[PDB]
Ligand SMILES: OC[C@H]1O[C@H](O)[C@@H](O)[C@@H](O)[C@@H]1O
Ligand SMILES: OC[C@H]1O[C@H](O)[C@@H](O)[C@@H](O)[C@@H]1O
């Protein structure tokens with residue numbers, strides 16, 4: 742059962758554990774790089790890194806996928822865009838009016854799958 | 863509404879967006895360092911870094927807290943441990959039989975709070 746719990750007091754300034762995203766891409770996503778950590782293969786070309794600002798999060802995203810992740814694009818609450826990166830295969834699915842909390846997945850030579858954890862608004 | 867969606871196919875090896883954790887601790891948690899990104903102050907002492915392997919997640923975690931986070935310890939599904947680090951103040955709460963997905967929080971000179979996103983089994 743997916744949930745969250747807060748521990749501690751009321752001070753400080755908020756932070757998120759998710760800080761940056763890059764990809765390697767060609768016809769597919771070869772890799773995703775999350776907070777600098779590489780997952781996937783060495784093919785394709787490395788995108789610039791998208792670093793989330795304070796209070797910035799993915800609010801909408803389009804993923805093309807099939808057996809692998811073919812393409813990713815996203816936009817943040819600040820209106821900044823990442824991608825599209827990747828190819829034209831697969832089929833498209835979109836998340837809208839969300840707040841992405843985390844990205845897990847599975848990878849080998851390519852990025853096989855993504856598990857997106859998000860709040861739906 | 864907190865939710866998960868998977869995109870892509872069945873192959874590859876699993877990874878998590880949450881790759882590494884360290885803390886600065888003394889009496890309290892001065893800071894938490896998530897995937898290399900520092901959240902909190904410069905006091906206390908830096909712990910070693912715990913780096914998750916493929917398929918590995920936090921399965922049990924004990925947090926002591928009051929106004930701030932006093933202490934953290936955790937266990938993974940692979941029988942590995944982190945901590946305890948911090949002091950004996952506050953009161954303890956334990957998450958048991960979980961899969962941690964993300965660690966967010968709030969920080970200033972110390973780690974005021976943690977907002978742990980997880981699956982509860
Ligand atoms: O993205 C998959 C594949 O697409 C293309 O064929 C090239 O860009 C390769 O380098 C890459 O590995
Ligand atoms: O995801 C890679 C690939 O997987 C399958 O072969 C199909 O869904 C393709 O359209 C897609 O491009």
Ligand SMILES: OC[C@H]1O[C@H](O)[C@@H](O)[C@@H](O)[C@@H]1O
Pocket residue numbers: 848849850851852853872873874875
């Ligand atoms: O990522 C594409 C592909 O790469 C390798 O061949 C293995 O890791 C497979 O399991 C994976 O599906």
Ligand SMILES: OC[C@H]1O[C@H](O)[C@@H](O)[C@@H](O)[C@@H]1O
Pocket residue numbers: 887888889890891892904905906907
């Ligand atoms: O952890 C809070 C505080 O605890 C102690 O007083 C010392 O270890 C300090 O360096 C640290 O800042």
Ligand SMILES: OC[C@H]1O[C@H](O)[C@@H](O)[C@@H](O)[C@@H]1O
Pocket residue numbers: 890927928929930931932950951952953
């Ligand atoms: O969390 C820091 C500190 O907050 C309060 O002063 C009390 O809850 C203490 O027991 C705890 O050590």
Ligand SMILES: OC[C@H]1O[C@H](O)[C@@H](O)[C@@H](O)[C@@H]1O
Pocket residue numbers: 751752753754969970971972973974
């Ligand atoms: O982290 C402890 C403390 O540090 C600062 O003084 C501010 O950021 C406070 O809001 C916070 O409670």
